[PDB]
Amino acid sequence: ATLNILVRNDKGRSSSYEVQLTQTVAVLKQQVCQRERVQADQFWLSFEGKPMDDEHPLGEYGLTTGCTVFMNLRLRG
Amino acid sequence: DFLDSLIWERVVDDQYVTNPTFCISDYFEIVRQPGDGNCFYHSIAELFFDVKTPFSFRKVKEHLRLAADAFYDTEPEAIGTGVTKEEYIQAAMKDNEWGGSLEASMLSKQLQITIILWVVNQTEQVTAAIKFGPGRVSTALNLMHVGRTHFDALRVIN
């Protein structure tokens, strides 16, 4: 049972990602790296005010179809 | 006014994001900082203290050591990193060690101030801003992040 979620990127643009609730956040971060052409260590993901831990399955955050995960940049300078 | 009318999306706790598109120079004056690896702390020092010296950034890093000890273990940016509080502190305290959003989040809470990092492309156009703390733009400490490698300070034009 695959799921369609939105990820809001660092420009504020949202696009669809096909995920499984059983896959880890790290796998979703890999999908975001592929589309946004970024490295995994350059951002973290959040949902409904909670940071998403790489090793936990997406289901643990209550993702549903049409929900929006936020892409948050790790800034260093 | 324009800056205080932006819509902020809450990320976690007191961290917010917004993605307007405007030229940073139309609303801010840029206060340029050296490219010595300490520009983040220079930029904070430029706006937080009344007197600016080439070593004021060290007083900011002293507050960072107090901030990290009290907030690092609960920082949302520091999840899935596997780096303990002690490993981060002495590594972040080295001279010329870069800082940024993680340090802004903890310093915001330690100093009870609002800090905003404005992400700017090469056209000096804003692409994103991250606000740490509950305050408004006109009262916040506004920094400019350019080239994904440098920080300058910003002052709100009137």
Author numbering:
A (entry chain B): 80 to 156
B (entry chain A): 2 to 159
Quote from the publication.
Beyond the RNA-dependent RNA polymerase (RdRp), the L protein contains a viral homologue of the ovarian tumor domain protease (OTU) at the N-terminus. This OTU reverses posttranslational modifications by ubiquitin (Ub) and interferon (IFN) stimulated gene product 15 (ISG15). Sheep ISG15 was derivatized into a suicide inhibitor with propargylamine and incubated with KUPEV and GANV OTUs to form covalent complexes that could be used for X-ray crystallography. This yielded an atomic resolution structure of KUPEV OTU bound to the C-terminal domain of sheep ISG15 (C-sheep ISG15) solved to 2.06 Å and a low-resolution structure of GANV OTU bound to full length sheep ISG15 to 3.15 Å.
Examination of the high resolution KUPEV and low resolution GANV OTU-sheep ISG15 structures reveals them to possess the familiar overall mode of OTU-substrate binding, in which the OTU binds to the C-terminal domain of ISG15 by a mix of hydrophobic and electrostatic interactions. On the sheep ISG15 side, the interface with the OTUs is formed by W123, P130, and F149. One of the most noteworthy interactions is that of sheep ISG15 D89 forming water-mediated interactions with both KUPEV OTU T128 and R149. Interestingly, this results in D89 pointing away from the interface, contrasting with previous observations for this residue position in OTU-Ub structures and CCHFV OTU-human ISG15 structures. Considering the selectivity pocket in KUPEV is lined by hydrophobic residues V18, V120, A129, and I131, the adoption of a more solvent-exposed confirmation of the charged aspartate in sheep ISG15 is understandable. For instance, the OTUs from KUPEV and DUGV have limited activity for human proISG15, but efficiently cleave sheep and cow proISG15s and show moderate activity towards camel and vesper bat proISG15s. In the KUPEV OTU residue 122 is an asparagine residue, while CCHFV is unique among OTUs with an alanine at this position. As anticipated, the GANV OTU E122N mutant reduced activity for human ISG15-AMC almost 10-fold, while KUPEV OTU N122E boosted activity more than 6-fold relative to WT. In KUPEV OTU this residue is an isoleucine, creating the potential for a steric clash with the longer glutamate in human ISG15 compared to aspartate in sheep ISG15. In contrast, the KUPEV helix mutant (I80R/G81L/T82V) demonstrates a 5-fold increase in human ISG15-AMC activity while reducing Ub-AMC activity by half.
